[PDB]
Paper text:
The structural and biophysical experiments showed that MFV PR-RT is a monomer upon binding to RNA/DNA and a dimer when it interacts with dsDNA.
The second crystal form was obtained using a deletion variant of MFV PR-RT that lacked the RH domain (MFV PR-RT ΔRH) and was grown in the presence of 13-bp dsDNA with a 5′ overhang of 2 nt in one strand (substrate 2) (see Materials and Methods for the sequence). Unexpectedly, the complete model of MFV PR-RT ΔRH revealed a dimer of the protein that interacted with the dsDNA duplex. One subunit that we termed subunit A adopts a structure that is analogous to the monomeric form that is observed in the full-length MFV PR-RT hybrid complex structure (RMSD of 2.6 Å over 477 Cα atoms), with small differences in the positions of the individual (sub)domains. However, the conformation of the other subunit (subunit B) is markedly different. The palm/finger module remains largely the same, but the position of the finger/thumb module is completely rearranged such that it blocks the POL active site. This conformation is very similar to the ones that were observed for the p51 subunit of HIV-1 RT and subunit B of Ty3 RT, with the largest differences in the positioning of the thumb subdomain. Similar to other RT structures, the recessed 3′ end of the DNA interacts with the POL active site of subunit A. The PR domains of both subunits are also visible in the structure. Interestingly, they interact with each other. However, the dimeric arrangement of the PR domains in our structure is markedly different from the architecture of stand-alone PRs such as the HIV-1 enzyme and would not allow active-site formation. In the PR-RT ΔRH structure, protein-dsDNA interactions are observed along almost the entire length of the nucleic acid, and these contacts are mostly mediated by subunit A of the dimer.
Numbering used by the authors:
A (entry chain A): 5 to 51, 53 to 571
B (entry chain B): 3 to 37, 61 to 71, 73 to 227, 243 to 365, 378 to 475, 478 to 578
DNA sequence: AACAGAGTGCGACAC
DNA sequence: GTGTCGCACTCTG
């Protein structure tokens, strides 16, 4: 199974894709630049442009052929099937077929559109039936040149395979046989060999990931920075109708060069196999994959893609359906497929990257709220760091989070070894955290076209910070700073100022080039510049940071006569 | 009428940039491969030799199917309307003005007719990875969505010319966008973490011709490209040329034009501008053709919009190129009081200061209230204190071995800088604020007087380190700023970042000499 | 016995 | 003191 056909043009060799939807064979423009056009016809593209028809001879699979071609936007050949009536690809048969008709039916009934709009929806999914995952372990075929992932200078030491869990050996076995049939795996001896280590899932199945740490040591990390879960969450748009589309087995769609394949080798039940697409557990497999998908969809407005999960939102369902179809088409020509089960399209609210995007705003999921009620008091340091780490996820949703978490954070230094000094008063602290997070509010998004309002204030012990959009009533996020020992000795103004400094470090990124406005209990900034030196208790290096903000043009300050306290 | 362009090549599973020269029928390729048959643009054919650089020369006789086309970007500037403006702005005699128009039109290949158009120097490419330890890759935050299509069009244009290519690198530099005056945005590359790992490298008729994006005309070697990488729309983009914001890119840029024009006397280039002056209009036009020819042959392109010529007045280095201390008397006690503070530094290095300064103290005390009476004799006793300080009073000569300390400050209408040597100063400075500068904020006033104090500083330094002392604070914070709070900077602080990234000069704030109300200099 | 990003705090050592 | 940079844990795909 090639699923890409060797095509030879002008004594050169490209790849030809057999497109049923191709009314005409296209061809890269570099080959038609010397030929004479024979006709002009409107040609269907993603963005129906009028192209010119040619007459060219070439050969596919080695057999001479010839017909009417046209210029292609890509470096590969789109093939009208009528141009090669002798060739016919066979269908696709793996192990377990999925209930794709059930996936569609489920996805429509959950859709928040009307019955007339629901019909428009139902037609669209039956139309792109070729786009949805139809078998277990079905992989797409990305039409990009293969990656050379073996960018190393020193060779890695081969690993002896260690123990595979017996409970996983049937699950991997089907995957390997399913991946072998689609050409993803190849039986091949190799210099390198790495251990296959399945990771569990909530369902009885198991994942194909491998201990690639030895290989990872000899390969440099790709420096691209295209995963920012917070930046997406804080900057996505939240109109009426929202939807998420989950790519399926995205790694296994990116081809890797043959010379780069040996580094992926692993041993399974006696024989040594070699990956052909980006394997899982490899250090550059994320950065390479997520680069391609985020590059593909950049021009789709209002979109947000995290690795293989795609969110967007519009106000009217009519536009949502147009953009949705545009997305499906871009994925299909690219060679990607979509898991319909993992995705949900058209709802007043949907959960994205661990938060629920309700019609009112970004909030904590019910699934998370159950996660935190169901914790017991910790017994070891690792347990303390897990309860702390889970709590930390929700930090932005309560005005004074950094207070109630401090008594728990302090317990890890006083603890010696893994044993910890938990008290009845300590458990009480744990309960207060959960109740505030239980009753925690709903968070706003960042208006990328409006100034950033940052309202700050401080008490003798800690300093509080809330962010808003100019005139916005619900905050984007909460923050607060516990004054350390050295900060406590500061004058009340210097406490306000070290609170402001810790805000602006964050608020500079939050503005996205917009202006910034500061509301504070400080009457005038100019009197602060001339505060007597025998009055300022903090060091001079802390006062150059604070005074520098008065010189930044992107920020102005304001006095707000609201909520003083001490 | 835009000019020709290069073509992508690839030989033996190796990606390379390729260039077309009409002359040679012998292609040449880097020798490292040759321990014949290869593809260019996708089509493949076979007669080569070795090349001087990592670049490839193609034989045009080898690829008949390829006929180059005029250069096409996204936005075409009105080249003729720029040409007529420089004609109409030329305060020169009319028949000569028409003759210059004829010369300007003759070189439609030197001017830029395309937004974000780049040139190309046939110089050997620059090895800019001259550090020893690699910079730590840097993280990136989400970009303002309104800023993306502006930057995307700029990147799309740079990709089509081959300036930017999509390549994965080990390193990564942040990118932050900033508003332009119009509705578009501008891309900034925050190369500080990169910069810290690499070693640092007049008459009647006047004119200023300004090269356009000269940085992007300098090829950089292939093994030095990885360090320039930034991540746009989730893919890493690598520069094939000197990037804006790199350390040694301004130095390597202007060092090329001064040597291009080394044989022409009287030139004065600064970063991106070119300065020439002549006695007549006949000589002025003869040098234009001489200078324009060198630029074309080398490979730059100049923007007619940003240039000015044949004017009795031009601007250059922030000043006015015209044709070919002291104060004003005080009115209230506040003016006189800020005078005493100005010269309070001099009590240390001047022997007879107490007696000269005694007039001032007596006037402040005798006249109660805010209404001061200052006799016309007091005005003359300041006339001596000015002239006494500048002439020769305890002024040490510049020591070429020691670093230079410069303390600057400004009044509302005038600016006052001074220079020491790591017991008394070297020399003094004075700037009167123009009508545009007079409307600035006191910070902005105190800021132009630093630029000007720094042009003389780099002159009087003779290469030594520099220490700047001003009432500007964020200068010193920007100098040493901890990396958790590094972040992005506002437009004004970028130009001074270029000065700041210099490991030789250091900025300080000392809090001395306030003078909010000092009467201006004499007219 | 896997990967990458985001986030947080702690903590030994630097200066 | 302020500051680096490695570690721990959590979340996301």
């Amino acid at each position: 199974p090639l699923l890409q056909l060797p095509v030879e043009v002008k004594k050169t060799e490209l790849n030809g894709f057999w497109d049923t939807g191709a009314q005409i064979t296209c061809i890269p423009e570099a080959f038609l630049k010397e030929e004479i056009p024979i006709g002009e016809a409107q040609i269907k593209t993603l963005h129906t442009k009028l192209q010119s028809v040619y007459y060219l001879k070439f050969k596919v699979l080695g057999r001479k052929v010839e017909a009417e071609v046209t210029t292609s936007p890509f470096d590969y050949v789109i093939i009208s099937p009528s141009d090669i009536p002798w060739y016919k690809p066979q269908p696709l048969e793996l192990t377990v077929k999925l209930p794709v008709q059930d996936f569609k039916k489920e996805l429509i009934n959950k859709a928040n559109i009307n019955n007339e709009e629901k019909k428009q929806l139902a037609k669209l999914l039956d139309k792109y039936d070729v786009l949805w995952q139809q078998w277990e372990n079905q992989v797409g075929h990305r039409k990009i040149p293969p990656h050379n992932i073996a960018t190393g200078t020193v060779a890695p030491r081969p690993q002896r395979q260690y123990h595979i869990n017996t409970k996983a050996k049937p699950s991997i076995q089907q995957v390997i046989d399913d991946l072998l049939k689609q050409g993803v795996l190849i039986k091949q001896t190799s210099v390198m060999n790495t251990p296959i280590y399945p990771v569990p899932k909530p369902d009885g199945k198991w994942r194909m990931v491998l201990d690639y740490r030895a290989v990872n040591k000899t390969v440099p990390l790709i420096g691209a920075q295209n995963q920012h879960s917070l930046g997406i969450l804080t900057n996505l748009v939240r109109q009426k109708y929202k939807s998420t589309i989950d790519l399926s087995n995205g790694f296994w769609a990116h081809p890797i060069t043959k010379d780069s394949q040996w580094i992926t080798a692993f041993t399974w039940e006696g024989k040594q196999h070699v990956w052909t697409r980006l394997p899982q557990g490899f250090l550059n497999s994320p950065a390479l994959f997520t680069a391609d998908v985020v590059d593909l969809l950049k021009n789709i407005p209002g979109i947000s893609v995290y690795v293989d999960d795609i969110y967007f939102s519009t106000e009217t369902v009519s536009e949502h359906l147009k953009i949705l179809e545009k997305v499906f088409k871009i994925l299909l020509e690219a060679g990607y497929i979509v898991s319909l089960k993992k995705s949900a399209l058209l709802r007043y609210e949907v959960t994205f990257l661990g938060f629920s995007i309700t019609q009112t705003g970004r909030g904590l999921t019910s699934e998370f709220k159950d996660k935190i009620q169901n914790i017991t008091s910790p017994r070891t340091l690792k347990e303390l760091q897990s309860i702390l780490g889970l709590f930390n996820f929700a930090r932005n949703f309560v005005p004074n989070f950094s207070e109630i978490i401090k008594p728990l954070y302090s317990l890890i230094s006083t603890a010696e070894g893994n044993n910890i000094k938990w008290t009845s008063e300590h458990t009480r602290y744990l309960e207060e955290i959960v109740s505030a997070l239980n009753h925690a509010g709903n968070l706003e998004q960042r208006d990328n076209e409006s100034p950033l309002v940052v309202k700050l204030n401080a008490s003798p012990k800690t300093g509080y910070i809330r962010y808003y959009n100019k005139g916005g009533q619900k905050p984007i996020a909460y923050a607060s700073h516990v004054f350390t020992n050295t900060e406590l000795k500061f004058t009340p103004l210097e406490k306000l100022l070290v609170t402001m400094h810790k805000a602006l470090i964050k608020a500079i990124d939050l503005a996205l080039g917009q202006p910034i406005e500061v509301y504070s209990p400080i009457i005038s900034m100019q009197k602060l510049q001339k505060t007597p030196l025998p009055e300022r208790k903090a060091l001079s290096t802390r006062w150059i940071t604070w005074l520098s903000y008065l010189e930044d043009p992107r920020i102005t300050f304001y006095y707000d006569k609201t909520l003083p306290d001490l």
